[PDB]
Amino acid sequence: ELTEDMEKEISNALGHGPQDEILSSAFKLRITRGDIQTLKNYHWLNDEVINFYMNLLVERNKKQGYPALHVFSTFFYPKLKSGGYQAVKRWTKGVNLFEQEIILVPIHRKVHWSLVVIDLRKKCLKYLDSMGQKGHRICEILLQYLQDESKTKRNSDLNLLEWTHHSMKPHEIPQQLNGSDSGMFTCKYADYISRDKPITFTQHQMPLFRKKMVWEILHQQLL
């Protein structure tokens, strides 16, 4: 599904050069070789790739008329757990979360990625973990956040009795089979979910997606 030309780029990208060379600039992130190397097999992805990738989803949806998406920094959820609504109040500035259809929040549990899908249209919070763990209180925390934004930015209490959450169980969604691909599921879970698309994929697709992703980043485009 890739070409020789594409496969070359990807190779020249994935090693051989200066740790710090700048490979792709956008969303005011500077993706450096060392970053891109995180996409190498079994390598764990650092925040830089997932932030960059998230942003590419937004620009993807925008060009194919997919649901309005808003994407949070991998840092957002630590900081809000750490020092509460008040810590992350400004983060959402030029933006009204509530005119958006989908909110993706990537969770960085310890040495491990997850995702929360906040679906405004369904008034629902979906936690996904490729490693099968429950997102119960990740969830309560974030909803509480929306209450706070709704109150603070819109001046409107939220109707918390209409809001549901459910964290997806090991059998409901695709699990990982190596100890390295979570950040790739986190990313691919985002992608399908942001297109209203049922999750057809499996771990076995993930190495291509890996190889594929570094293309996506370089060319700032999705396939």
Binding site: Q19, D20, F27, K28, L29, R30, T32, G34, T38, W44, L45, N46, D47, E48, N51, S73, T74, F75, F76, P78, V88, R90, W91, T92, K93, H108, R109, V111, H112, W113, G179, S180, D181, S182, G183
Partner: protein, 78 residues
């Protein structure tokens, strides 16, 4: 010489800067890393959520006097 900024972080010292308004923020980001021991690729510098890059100008983002910059460390997960 236009503006005061505080730069804080987790396992990182508080350090006040005195940056010019149209000076690129790379210097700020770099001097801070030095003073820390830490490598330049090692931290991310957030202003009010948004990522500062090297070229960015305190004018260009409309930083304000005593605005705080925020320091987070690279995160990896498997």
């Amino acid at each position: 010489e236009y503006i005061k900024l505080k730069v804080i972080g987790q396992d990182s010292s508080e350090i006040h800067f005195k940056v010019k308004m149209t000076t690129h923020l790379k210097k700020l980001m770099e001097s801070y890393c030095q003073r820390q021991g830490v490598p330049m690729n090692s931290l991310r510098f957030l202003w009010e959520g948004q990522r500062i890059a090297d070229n960015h100008t305190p004018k260009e983002l409309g930083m304000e006097e005593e605005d705080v910059i925020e320091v987070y460390q690279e995160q990896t997960g498997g």
